[PDB]
Amino acid sequence: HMDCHLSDMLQQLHSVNASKPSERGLVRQEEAEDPACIPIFWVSKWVDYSDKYGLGYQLCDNSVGVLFNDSTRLILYNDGDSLQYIERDGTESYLTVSSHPNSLMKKITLLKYFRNYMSEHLLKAGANITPRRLPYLRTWFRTRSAIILHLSNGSVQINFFQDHTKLILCPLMAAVTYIDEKRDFRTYRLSLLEEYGCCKELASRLRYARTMVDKLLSSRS
């Protein structure tokens, strides 16, 4: 199944949700935590100017990217010079800001504007956390309750507007990282949540997640 791991994630989430992990009673949510499953990448900041320009974001490694409206993406590495350009094909090329390339000067100017805004005006998600091919934003959408961000490495991140809680779902670890209201970052193996269960708040977000992954799978291309 070649859908950037979305099918796998749907299965991991059906399985956890079907186990009804909050209904239980011997809830040992801390027993489901697995430091071996800590994500390498997540989105630390984002800026939606999608009407006209696109969606800018920062990864936790301090790389910056933009998904332009024409469906190309440009990434500036944390060195502040190396570029990675992804055309619509998915085909990738590499360049530098200092080479001053005619073909991308407009997109580079737009990316630098995004970078500056995020640096000056936004705070990092998971800033207090040392993390464990640079992925890029494959697709995204927002509901009234969340923004849903699907990375090229198959991770899905859901940022909930009401309480600033966040889910980072990693299907290759079959794991979920939950950033709670107090900015506490905790990583769970999903199969250990089936077993030890969890609080009703995490259970509810995992139910919403399932629905969001269903929505990504329902609208490919």
Domain with residue 65: its CATH number is 3.30.1120.30
Q: How many CB atoms are located within 10 Å of the residue 102 CB?
A: 7
Give the chain's domain count. Answer: 2
Q: Which of 111, 134, 157 is the last residue of a domain?
A: 134
Same domain, 141 and 35: yes
Check: CB of residue 215 under 8 Å from CB of residue 142: no
Residues 177 and 191 in one domain: yes
State the pairing for strand pair 175-179/166-170.
Answer: antiparallel
User: Do 41 and 59 form a contact (C-beta atoms < 8 A)?
Assistant: yes
**187 closest CA partner among 26, 60, 32:** 32
Name the strands in the sheet holding 82-86, side by side, starting at the edge strand that comes first in the sequence: 43-49, 54-59, 64-68, 73-76, 82-86, 92-96
CA–CA gap between residue 44 and residue 126 (Å, rounded): 7
Query: Inter-axis angle of helices 6-18 and 200-218, to 10 degrees?
Result: 150
Q: 151: which 2 tokens?
A: 């990375």
Sheet holding 166-170, edge to edge: 137-142, 146-151, 156-160, 166-170, 175-179, 185-189
Q: Distance between CA atoms of 57 and 42, rounded to whole angstroms?
A: 10
If asked whether residues 129 and 150 sit together in one domain, one would say no
Q: How many residues belong to the chain?
A: 221
Same domain, 116 and 63: yes
Same domain membership, residue 168 and residue 106: no
Same domain? For 35 and 140 the reply is yes
Which residues, in sequence order, are CB contacts of 103 under 8 Å at separation 6+? none
Q: Which of 134, 166, 184 is the last residue of a domain?
A: 134
What are 169's strand-pairing partners? Answer: 156, 176
| Same domain for 208 and 146 | yes
Do 61 and 35 have their domain in common?
A: no
Which structural technique was applied?
X-ray
Token code pair at residue 10: 């749907």
Residues 141, 128 within the same domain: no
Residues 22 and 95 in one domain: no
For 136, residues 6+ apart whose C-beta sits below 8 A from its C-beta are 65, 67, 73, 75, 84, 86, 151, 152
**Which residues have C-beta within 8 Å of that of residue 145, sequence separation ≥ 6?**
160, 161, 162, 208
Full 3-state SS string of the chain: CCCCCHHHHHHHHHHHHHCCCCCCCCCCHHHHECHHHCCCCCEEEEEEECCCCEEEEEECCCCEEEEECCCCEEEECCCCCEEEEECCCCCEEEEECCCCCHHHHHHHHHHHHHHHHHHHHCCCCCCCCCCCCCCCEEEEEECCCEEEEEECCCCEEEEECCCCCEEEEECCCCEEEEECCCCCEEEEEHHHHHHHCCCHHHHHHHHHHHHHHHHHHHCCC
**CA angle 177-120-151, nearest 5°?**
35
Domain assignment of residue 162, given as a range: 3-43+135-221
